[PDB]
C-alpha cells in the first residue's frame, strides 16, 4: 500500500493509491510521459524509491520520498 501524488506544469494535480511496488511504477510510468513536474511517494518500498529515482533523476523531475521499510529483510 503506496501513496501517490502527481503534479504538471500546467498547475493541475492528482492523487493515486497503488496496492503494490508493480502498481506503483505504472502510476509513475504513466506520469513522466505528460512532463509531469513534481511526483510523491509515500509508504513506498526501498526497490520502488530506488526504481522511481532512477527515472525521476534521469528526467530532472522534482520527486519527493515520504516512503522507507526498514529491518524485515532477514537472511537466507
Same mark, same amino acid.
Given at each position: 500500500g503506496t501513496e501517490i501524488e502527481l503534479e504538471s506544469k500546467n498547475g493541475q494535480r +492528482? $492523487?493515486?493509491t497503488a496496492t503494490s511496488e508493480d502498481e506503483a511504477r505504472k502510476i509513475? +510510468?504513466?506520469?513522466? =510521459?505528460?512532463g509531469i513536474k513534481?511526483? +510523491?511517494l509515500r509508504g513506498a518500498s526501498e526497490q520502488l524509491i530506488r526504481d522511481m529515482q532512477e527515472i525521476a533523476k534521469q528526467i530532472g &523531475?522534482?520527486? =519527493?520520498?515520504?516512503?522507507? &521499510? +526498514?529491518? $524485515?529483510?532477514?537472511?537466507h
Open positions: +492528482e $492523487h493515486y509513475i +510510468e504513466k506520469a513522466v =510521459r505528460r513534481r511526483i +510523491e &523531475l522534482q520527486y =519527493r520520498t515520504d516512503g522507507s &521499510l +526498514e529491518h $524485515h529483510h532477514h537472511h
